[PDB]
Scaffold this active site. Structure first.
Site, PDB file in Angstrom:
ATOM      1  N   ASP A  90       0.831  -1.193   0.000  1.00 50.07           N
ATOM      2  CA  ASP A  90       0.000   0.000   0.000  1.00 50.07           C
ATOM      3  C   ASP A  90       0.871   1.252   0.000  1.00 50.07           C
ATOM      4  O   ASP A  90       2.097   1.192   0.113  1.00 50.07           O
ATOM      5  CB  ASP A  90      -0.938   0.003   1.211  1.00 50.07           C
ATOM      6  CG  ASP A  90      -0.186   0.026   2.527  1.00 50.07           C
ATOM      7  OD1 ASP A  90       0.912  -0.565   2.597  1.00 50.07           O
ATOM      8  OD2 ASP A  90      -0.688   0.642   3.490  1.00 50.07           O
ATOM      9  N   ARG A 129       0.038   3.876   2.188  1.00 51.14           N
ATOM     10  CA  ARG A 129      -0.308   4.632   3.386  1.00 51.14           C
ATOM     11  C   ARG A 129       0.818   4.554   4.409  1.00 51.14           C
ATOM     12  O   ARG A 129       1.142   3.471   4.907  1.00 51.14           O
ATOM     13  CB  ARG A 129      -1.612   4.114   3.988  1.00 51.14           C
ATOM     14  CG  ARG A 129      -1.968   4.764   5.317  1.00 51.14           C
ATOM     15  CD  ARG A 129      -3.285   4.245   5.871  1.00 51.14           C
ATOM     16  NE  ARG A 129      -4.422   4.606   5.029  1.00 51.14           N
ATOM     17  CZ  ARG A 129      -5.683   4.289   5.304  1.00 51.14           C
ATOM     18  NH1 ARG A 129      -5.972   3.603   6.402  1.00 51.14           N
ATOM     19  NH2 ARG A 129      -6.656   4.657   4.483  1.00 51.14           N
ATOM     20  N   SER A 148       2.618  -4.646  10.067  1.00 54.70           N
ATOM     21  CA  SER A 148       1.573  -4.796  11.071  1.00 54.70           C
ATOM     22  C   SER A 148       0.278  -5.362  10.503  1.00 54.70           C
ATOM     23  O   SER A 148      -0.572  -5.813  11.277  1.00 54.70           O
ATOM     24  CB  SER A 148       1.295  -3.450  11.745  1.00 54.70           C
ATOM     25  OG  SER A 148       0.823  -2.498  10.807  1.00 54.70           O
ATOM     26  N   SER A 158      -2.845   0.740   7.128  1.00 58.96           N
ATOM     27  CA  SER A 158      -2.926   0.190   5.781  1.00 58.96           C
ATOM     28  C   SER A 158      -4.105   0.812   5.046  1.00 58.96           C
ATOM     29  O   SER A 158      -5.201   0.923   5.606  1.00 58.96           O
ATOM     30  CB  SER A 158      -3.069  -1.333   5.818  1.00 58.96           C
ATOM     31  OG  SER A 158      -1.964  -1.931   6.474  1.00 58.96           O
TER      32      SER A 158
END
Lengths: 204, 240, 232, 220, 250, 240, 239, 228
Positions: free
Chosen positions: D17, D19, D129, D169
């Protein structure tokens, strides 16, 4: 944290064909006023500036050390440095000490040496690169800085509404936290010509 | 043409010729060792002989051939003092290669190291230039056969028919028109011409105990030190 | 070890360095080499011929490019050529770490000649007889550079090196005019290869690299026979 | 900040991703965690961005000089040995979470990068994570020797599943496809999370801003 | 093992360092430079070594290199051996800017390079620097500063300098046309042009075979100006044309 | 002139006389030999006594490395002790990293690295010392080796050093390399060394003995000369 | 580093390239000096200036402190190193023991440093010498000398350089204890010395004077013509 | 044939060192005398010009409290050895709390006399005359540049060395007192001095347990001059 001693917020807001940067005039210790004269933004090279927010020692250290490397670069070959190589040069020095790292929040607002393309980047003390066309800010208040950009800033903006938006940005945001204030200095640069404006806050 | 100590050290003459390593070219003739290498289609062959002063000569220390890794092996010429140390340096380069890189060595980069090593020692004349000649074979996928020879001049070159030594000028000059042409190469064909090239200068047809002959073909890539039994089988096979 | 590192190569009564004069003599007795900077890119040709039929061009190369967009040729010995190439590959990372961008042509010539000129004042031996030809394409205009043992480098469109470097260059002075293209540069490269030929027009007796603004391209001898078979 | 991928039959497909933020405050929606290595190998960054970028620049440095000197396509384990050796020397001082994968002539290879340097070969790995829900969707729905198109659907659904689950995320989706005859870096892909239009117009106008000194610096 | 070195450092039976003589011959061979008087400006002139017209010359200034924004230096000697001192002194002037964040007066900078130039002389039998270079620039105190470097370690700085055996004939012309302010930058242009006309053996004094540079003091620019060949062409043409008016004494 | 001065500088013949000057310097040394049967390796040395000169048993050229390996040297005595002590402590490195006996074939590689490196550098010189290396073990076997100032690592079933060398080892071929029992070969070689290496020149001399093998269970020490007096118990009747 | 023998001891009693490097000082320009209870003076000649340019920076006399004057002979490079090295010494003696530098302390440094600079290998001796002129603390005067071997000795007057025996023979008039009763007589003494030493004159003459705590002053080429006027007129007054 | 500068001689000995031993013969003349009342000594300053200042030239130095020293030939190298050995006398007073013995000055100097070597630097031509009084009474000591130490009741160095000792062998005896040693030595000194005797030509160096230091003082030497 050490970032709560000097503090400071460098707001670099890019316009349509140009890039602008602004910082607070006040330089002091916590809420005790000292002087508004020290400017946290320094000119580097031709048609390029850099903002810095953090410990004033590391701020002036980046100012003198970037001047070191940049002078060696320009004196070797007369070509003007590209902003991408400049960011990799900043992230290089900040990464040179992994366990000894200094405290700074470098914000580079500059133009393209070849063309009118502007540039904005904001890196951490370890030199985390971020390359976007929108805006870059580093400072104390997290909600206020990016919140005013979400509530106001647009991708395509003229310098008239660019300075007016960043004005109320540096007003409704910076005035929230007392560590930054006592006037705001604004630097807007473009291929055409360089313009510099200032603001005013409460003197208490 | 010589200024001061020039004759005794390594610099460039008016024509740019080195005085010390040209003595290293005649430093190979000590012992009179002649090693010839013939690399065929699927195989590569090494052939070398020895001199026996008396019966006290040990058969275990006979072998002048060296083995880099289980896949690849080497052969040296000239003075044995520089050869044993340069081979131990090849052991260090191969062991460090598998350690840090962790995959098969092309044998080309090993010859690049030795080519620069003998060159760096040719640079500064206050250490011995190490004029020993380095000759290897190679085994690598998709490249077919591999043979590389690192010369004391500091460069690496090797191919199908390549050899170095005192008498290799004669034999390899015969191998010019003898090898190709069109001639196809099998196991017994490459070993046969490895005997005939030795039969050009010598033609002694001595028992197999005297020669040191390595050969490597690709079925099991591991190179094997030859036993005098199979060479004796090839010696009676080359007599017509 | 000893570690003397003294400067023993000294000034002649005329002021020059007799050892470097022996170095340029090793370059003057070097293999014929030529390159042409024209328009879009640079073309390198020179010559490689084995001492016998036992060697082939498919493995060992006299021309190894320094980068994907930067090729290099030279005159003199190969062992010291691969030595300065090895240092050139290492030095390319000292540049790339700070810049994170490819390297200009002259940027190599500055630091390579500095280490080369340092190796003069430094002890031991000298730049020897290897005169390197650096080429590449940057900022839309490619470049062709050559230095000497003493470190003096100059820029031009084309030059001849090795043996008969004066005769081949005087032939290139009349042939090369205004600007040329890649095909025309290869054509007159066959002309300067036919100067000392020997092995011109044959694919296995020469190797042709070509620089372009899209990056350096190293073609196998197959393409050398493609353009020139049929030569000219 | 979540990186994950799966190795299908004929190649490797990876994803990440854009982010990277801190807390619930939206800061940077666009970040590229997929970094270049070589034609046969890519890399996915996580954890500390700047430190892992300087690490992948040194690995790309070693593979650049070695592949250029060898002139051949290097194996993935060549960089993995230096990766596991350098990070092991620090014993985890510099946090490093990466996805090391690539398709060579020997076929696809996958290795999990940890700060200590322990590397194991698996058909799929999940780092960051958001590795909980991604591993759950993988382990449950994964079957071996899938084709490339079904692997794209698995990576798309797995990364999009970890978006909502994980806190950091979201934003854009990045695709990484590695094969022998083809190398595909596809960015961006899909942006499920957005932020709506402004509630009102605070747009500034002249006359409410007092300017002290306006300096003009003409150029050229 | 003591007989290999030639003892360039160790003293000679002549009572002085023997290698310094051949060093002054190294700079005294093919090196051609000069200097002009400084009145509200200064200029530089040298000889272009390149006789090949096919060369690119894309490096702008050939023999003149810029050490600082407001201060540069002329150089004469071996190219790369001088280029080592270019970046070295550039870094010495940069570490001074790294210290005070302010430009460097040439005085202590030249003496610093002289202390570096004596390194090869005073230890190890090293080969001394075969490069002697000039100095130009401006400072807050003395204004335009024009200095000179010597292989013996001295700074021989004058506002009018001579480099090379061929330029040794210009010293008589320098004192024949000698004046002080008085001299305009234009007068120094015709002064140095007649210097090359007397010294350089090139017929008609070709403009493209010799290097010319200037300097100006502007606030706060103080530009070191590299000039196009257009004004030098018309300069030397107008110069020898003024000389055609100077032969009217007959 | 003087191409032979430096060891790092070659000569027009392709070698360095510093090694050659050291070779014939060993030729002035007295008898240094070795021989290996199936049961062990016999060592002996002839001591030359100029006048008295001193007490018996002092500074003998026979030295020791490990319990299974020992030194019999020749040439200069001090540098012999040097390389003996270097190889002495070198076995402690193999004993520290592993803990079993050091193979003698690869132990000579260390001395090969030391002697060759001293021939490499121009600052230092080559050592003018040669020596013999031999040993036997139940898990290893009998290995005898010979190293000279040139740094050659090689071995024979038997070898000699000193003035009488090739003439001394000629008749040794009568003693077999295997079938013979080195326990009896003690006096068998003693009759050779007593007759050979002519003592008419210098009448005053002395003889030393040592052994290693299975009878002592891989222990290298001196087989007693005072016990059974095997040296002159026979050889007194061998020359008449 | 760099290993080699600078100079070796010859049975003749001295080294070679060191004691023969005294000729590098012997071939230098003429330099003299005179200590005094009121004002101390010195002089130098053979400036070899072009006279068309600025020669102020080639000055052969510098000052570590206002009370310390450096007078040297020989080549300039080793002189500048003696300057900067003594500047490190005078500044270290400024930091430690704040009061200014005594002449015995600076002569011990300059001389013994040059000696230990001749001792260690890979260090070539300076081809220069020097002599100190100034005023010791509490009003006392000072003069000393320096040797290539680093030996310092105090004279009554300083005569060195080219023609050291010629100027010392001219000091027969300087041996008078009445010189100098006044500063005008001291400059007149240097006027007679500079006129005699050596080739001179009217241009290349360069000197300076210092009296007690007053800092040294370099007179313009105006009063120098006045001292040369009365000195040249003294010959007409002696008839 | 210059080889290594460290090369031996076939006779033999160190080349460069023995050459400096002959270089001692051009130095100043100095004669020490050992006497139960004290160890005296004197030297000739060798005036090179009437401008010479008397107190600037001294050939005798004071190492420890009661320990003196003299110099020969080359000066500055010995002057460095002087104060460098004084540091070792102070380090002697560190642990031992008392004055360094005069015999231990040999181990404090002659051991480090020549450490010179090409790597890790050149010998000396100066011989030292060690005066002093230890716990056992007056002691006169002398060392060479090579480090060889010998105890001498009277020792002369420099030019008059061989000539002064050859003449002084007769006048010296075990019963020589202090004042007698001073006035009988200046007879040799006035013979070995070229210039007419004055206060600036020669200086006296004495060490006594009860009178010190002393050394010696000026204007008293003139009182001994009129006693010539």
């Amino acid at each position: 944290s050490i970032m709560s001693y000097n503090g400071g917020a460098v707001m670099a807001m890019k316009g349509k064909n140009c890039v602008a940067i602004a910082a607070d005039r006040r330089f002091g210790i916590q809420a005790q006023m000292v002087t508004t004269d020290f400017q946290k933004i320094f000119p580097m090279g031709d048609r390029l500036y850099i903002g810095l927010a953090g410990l004033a020692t590391d701020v002036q250290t980046v100012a003198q050390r970037l001047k070191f490397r940049l002078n060696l670069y320009e004196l070797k070959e007369g070509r003007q440095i590209k902003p991408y190589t400049l960011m990799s040069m900043v992230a290089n020095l900040l990464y040179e000490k992994r366990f000894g790292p200094y405290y700074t929040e470098p914000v580079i607002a500059g133009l393209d040496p070849k063309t009118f393309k502007p540039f904005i980047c904001s890196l951490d003390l370890i030199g985390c690169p971020m390359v976007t066309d929108d805006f870059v800010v580093s400072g104390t208040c997290a909600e206020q800085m990016y919140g005013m950009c979400e509530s106001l800033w647009e991708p395509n903006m003229d310098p008239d509404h660019l300075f007016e938006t960043i004005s109320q940005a540096m007003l409704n945001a910076v005035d929230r936290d007392a560590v930054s204030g006592m006037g705001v200095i604004v630097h807007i640069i473009e291929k055409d010509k360089i313009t510099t404006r200032t603001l005013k806050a409460r003197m208490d | 043409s010589s200024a001061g100590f020039d004759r005794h050290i390594t610099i460039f003459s008016p024509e740019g010729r080195l005085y010390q390593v040209e003595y290293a070219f005649k430093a190979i003739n000590q012992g009179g060792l002649t090693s010839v290498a013939v690399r065929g289609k699927d195989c590569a062959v090494i052939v070398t002989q020895k001199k026996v002063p008396d019966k006290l000569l040990d058969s275990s220390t006979v072998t002048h051939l060296f083995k880099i890794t289980e896949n690849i092996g080497c052969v040296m010429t000239g003075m044995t003092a520089d050869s044993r140390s340069q081979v131990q340096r090849a052991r260090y380069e191969a062991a460090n290669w598998k350690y840090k890189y962790g995959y098969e060595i092309p044998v080309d980069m090993l010859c690049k190291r030795i080519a620069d090593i003998s060159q760096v020692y040719t640079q500064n004349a206050e250490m011995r230039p190490l004029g020993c000649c380095m000759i290897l074979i190679g085994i690598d996928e998709e490249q077919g056969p591999q043979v590389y020879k690192c010369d004391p001049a500091g460069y690496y070159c090797g191919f199908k028919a390549t050899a170095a030594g005192v008498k290799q000028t004669e034999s390899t000059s015969f191998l010019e028109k003898k090898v190709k042409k069109k001639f196809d190469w099998t196991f017994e064909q490459t070993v046969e011409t490895a005997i005939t090239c030795l039969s050009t200068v010598l033609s002694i047809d001595f028992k197999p105990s005297e020669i040191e002959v390595g050969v490597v073909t690709v079925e099991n890539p591991k190179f094997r030190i030859l036993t005098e039994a199979e060479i004796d089988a090839h010696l009676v096979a080359l007599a017509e | 070890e000893r570690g003397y590192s003294f400067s023993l190569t000294t000034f002649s009564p005329s002021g020059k360095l007799v050892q470097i004069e022996y170095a340029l003599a090793a370059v003057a007795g070097g293999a014929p080499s030529v390159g042409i900077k024209a328009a879009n890119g640079v073309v390198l040709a020179t010559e490689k011929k084995q001492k016998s039929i036992l060697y082939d061009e498919r493995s060992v190369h006299k021309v190894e490019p320094i980068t994907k967009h930067i090729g290099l040729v030279y005159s003199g010995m190969g062992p010291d050529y691969r030595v300065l190439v090895h240092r050139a590959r290492k030095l390319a990372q000292q540049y790339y770490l700070v810049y994170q961008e490819p390297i200009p042509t002259a940027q190599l010539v500055q630091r390579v000649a500095s280490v080369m000129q340092e190796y003069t004042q430094s002890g031991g031996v000298r730049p020897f007889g290897v005169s390197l030809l650096i080429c590449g394409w940057n900022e839309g205009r490619p470049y062709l550079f050559q230095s000497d043992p003493s470190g003096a480098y100059f820029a031009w469109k084309a030059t001849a090196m090795g043996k008969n470097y004066v005769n081949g260059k005087t032939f290139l002075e009349k042939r090369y005019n205004e600007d040329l293209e890649l095909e025309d540069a290869i054509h007159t490269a066959i002309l300067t290869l036919k100067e000392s030929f020997e092995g011109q027009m044959t694919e296995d007796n020469i190797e042709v690299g070509i620089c372009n603004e899209a990056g350096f391209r190293r073609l196998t001898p197959t393409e050398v026979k493609d353009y020139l078979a049929a030569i000219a | 900040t979540t990186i994950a991928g799966v190795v299908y039959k004929d190649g490797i497909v990876l994803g990440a991703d854009t982010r990277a933020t801190e807390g619930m405050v939206v800061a940077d929606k666009n970040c590229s965690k997929i970094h270049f290595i070589s034609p046969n190998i890519y890399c996915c960054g996580a954890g500390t961005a700047a430190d892992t970028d300087m690490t992948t620049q040194l690995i790309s440095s070693n593979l650049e000089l070695h592949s250029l000197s060898t002139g051949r396509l290097p194996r993935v384990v060549t960089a993995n040995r230096m990766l596991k050796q350098m990070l092991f020397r620090y014993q985890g001082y510099i946090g490093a979470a990466l996805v090391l994968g690539g398709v060579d002539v020997t076929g696809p290879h996958l290795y999990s990068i940890y700060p200590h340097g322990s590397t194991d070969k698996l058909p799929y790995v999940t780092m960051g994570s958001g590795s909980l829900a991604a591993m759950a969707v993988f382990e449950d729905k994964f079957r071996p020797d899938m084709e490339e198109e079904e692997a794209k659907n698995l990576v798309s659904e797995a990364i999009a599943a970890g978006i909502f689950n994980d806190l950091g995320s979201g934003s854009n989706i990045d695709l990484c496809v590695i094969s022998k005859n083809k190398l595909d870096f596809l960015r961006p892909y899909t942006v499920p999370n957005k932020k709506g239009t402004r509630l009102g117009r605070y747009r500034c106008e002249k006359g409410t801003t007092a300017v002290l000194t306006e300096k003009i610096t003409p150029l050229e | 093992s003591r007989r290999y070195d030639s003892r360039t450092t160790i003293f000679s039976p002549e009572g002085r360092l023997y290698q310094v003589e051949y060093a002054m011959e190294a700079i005294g061979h093919a090196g051609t430079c000069l200097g002009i008087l400084a009145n509200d400006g200064v200029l530089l002139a040298a000889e272009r070594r390149n006789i090949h017209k096919l060369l690119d010359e894309v490096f702008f200034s050939e023999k003149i290199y810029k050490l600082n924004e407001d201060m540069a230096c002329s150089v004469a000697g071996i190219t790369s051996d001088a280029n080592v001192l270019t970046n070295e002194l550039r870094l010495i002037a940069q570490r001074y800017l790294l210290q005070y964040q302010e430009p460097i007066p040439c005085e202590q900078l030249v003496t610093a390079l002289c202390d570096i130039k004596q390194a090869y002389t005073q230890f190890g039998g090293k080969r001394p620097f075969g490069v002697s270079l000039l100095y130009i620039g401006w400072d807050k105190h003395y204004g335009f500063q024009l200095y000179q470097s010597d292989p013996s370690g001295n700074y021989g700085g004058w506002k009018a300098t001579c480099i090379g055996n061929n330029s040794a004939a210009a010293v008589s012309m320098l004192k024949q046309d000698y004046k002080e302010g008085e001299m305009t930058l234009k007068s120094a242009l015709a002064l140095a042009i007649k210097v090359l006309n007397k010294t350089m053996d090139v017929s008609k004094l070709s403009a493209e075979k010799v290097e010319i540079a200037t300097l100006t003091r502007e606030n706060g620019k103080t530009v070191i100006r590299v000039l196009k060949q257009k004004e030098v062409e018309q300069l030397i043409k107008k110069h020898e044309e003024e000389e055609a008016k100077a032969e009217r004494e007959k | 002139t003087g191409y032979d001065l430096s060891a790092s500088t070659f000569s027009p013949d392709g070698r360095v006389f510093q090694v050659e000057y050291a070779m014939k310097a060993v030729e002035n040394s007295s008898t240094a030999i070795g021989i290996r049967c199936k049961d062990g390796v016999v060592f002996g040395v002839e001591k030359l006594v100029l006048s008295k000169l001193y007490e018996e048993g002092s500074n003998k050229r026979l030295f020791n490395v490990d319990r299974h390996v020992g030194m019999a040297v020749a040439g200069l005595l001090a540098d012999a002790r040097s390389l003996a002590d270097i190889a002495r402590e070198e076995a402690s490195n193999f004993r520290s990293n592993f803990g079993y006996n050091i193979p003698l074939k690869h132990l000579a590689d260390r001395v090969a690295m030391y002697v060759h490196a001293y021939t490499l550098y121009s600052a230092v010189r080559p050592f003018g010392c040669s020596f013999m290396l031999g040993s036997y073990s139940v898990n290893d076997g009998a290995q005898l080796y010979m190293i000279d100032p040139s740094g050659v690592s090689y071995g024979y079933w038997g070898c000699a050093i000193g003035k009488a060398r090739q003439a001394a080892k000629t008749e040794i071929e009568k003693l077999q390399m295997k079938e013979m029992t080195c326990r009896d070969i003690v006096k068998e070689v003693a009759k050779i060394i007593y007759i050979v290496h002519d003592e008419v020149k210098d009448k005053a001399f002395e003889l030393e003995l040592s052994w290693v093998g299975e009878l002592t269970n891989g222990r290298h020490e001196i087989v007693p000369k005072d016990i059974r007096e095997e040296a002159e118990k026979y050889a007194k009747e061998s020359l008449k | 580093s760099y290993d080699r023998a600078i100079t070796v001891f010859s049975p003749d009693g001295h080294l070679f390239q060191v004691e023969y490097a005294q000729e590098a000082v012997k071939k230098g320009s003429t330099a003299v000096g005179v200590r005094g209870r009121d004002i101390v003076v010195l002089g130098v000649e053979k400036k070899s200036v072009a006279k068309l340019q600025d020669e102020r920076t080639v000055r052969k006399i510098c000052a570590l402190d206002d009370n310390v004057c450096m007078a040297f002979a020989g080549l300039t490079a080793d002189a500048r190193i003696v300057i900067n090295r003594a500047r490190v010494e005078c500044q270290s003696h400024r930091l430690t023991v704040e009061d200014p530098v005594t002449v015995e302390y600076i002569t011990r440094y300059i001389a013994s440093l040059k000696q230990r600079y001749t001792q260690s290998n890979g260090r070539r001796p300076f081809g220069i010498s020097a002599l100190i002129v100034g005023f010791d603390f509490d009003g006392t005067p000072r003069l000393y000398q320096t040797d290539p071997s680093g030996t310092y000795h105090a004279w009554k007057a300083n005569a060195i350089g080219r023609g050291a025996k010629s100027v010392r023979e001219f000091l027969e008039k300087n041996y008078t204890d009445e010189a100098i009763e006044t500063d005008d007589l001291t400059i007149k003494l240097v006027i007679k010395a500079l006129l005699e030493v050596v080739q001179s004159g009217g241009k290349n003459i360069e000197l300076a004077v210092m009296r007690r705590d007053q800092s040294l002053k370099i007179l313009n080429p105006e009063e120098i013509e006045k001292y040369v006027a009365e000195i040249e007129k003294e010959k007409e007054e002696n008839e | 044939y210059d080889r290594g500068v460290n090369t031996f001689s076939p006779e033999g000995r160190l080349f460069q060192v023995e050459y400096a031993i002959e270089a001692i013969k051009l130095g100043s003349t100095a004669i020490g005398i050992q006497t139960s009342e004290g160890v005296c000594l004197a030297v000739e300053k060798r005036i090179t010009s009437p401008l010479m200042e008397p107190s600037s030239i001294e050939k005798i130095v004071e190492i420890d409290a009661h320990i003196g020293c003299a110099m020969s030939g080359l000066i500055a190298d010995a002057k460095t050895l002087i104060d460098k050995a004084r540091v070792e006398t102070q380090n002697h007073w560190f642990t031992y709390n008392e004055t360094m013995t005069v015999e231990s000055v040999t181990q404090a100097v002659s051991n480090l006399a020549l450490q010179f070597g090409e790597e890790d630097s050149r010998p000396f031509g100066v011989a030292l005359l060690f005066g002093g009084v230890d716990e056992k009474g007056p002691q006169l000591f002398h060392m060479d540049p090579s480090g060889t130490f010998v105890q001498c009741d009277a020792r002369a160095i420099g030019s008059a060395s061989e000539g002064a000792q050859s003449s002084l062998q007769e006048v010296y005896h075990k019963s020589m007192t202090l004042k007698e040693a001073i006035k009988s030595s200046l007879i040799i000194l006035k013979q070995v001095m070229e210039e007419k005797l004055n206060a600036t030509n020669i200086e006296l160096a004495t060490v006594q347990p009860g009178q010190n230091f002393h050394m010696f003082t000026k204007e008293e030497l003139e009182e001994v001059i009129k006693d010539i």
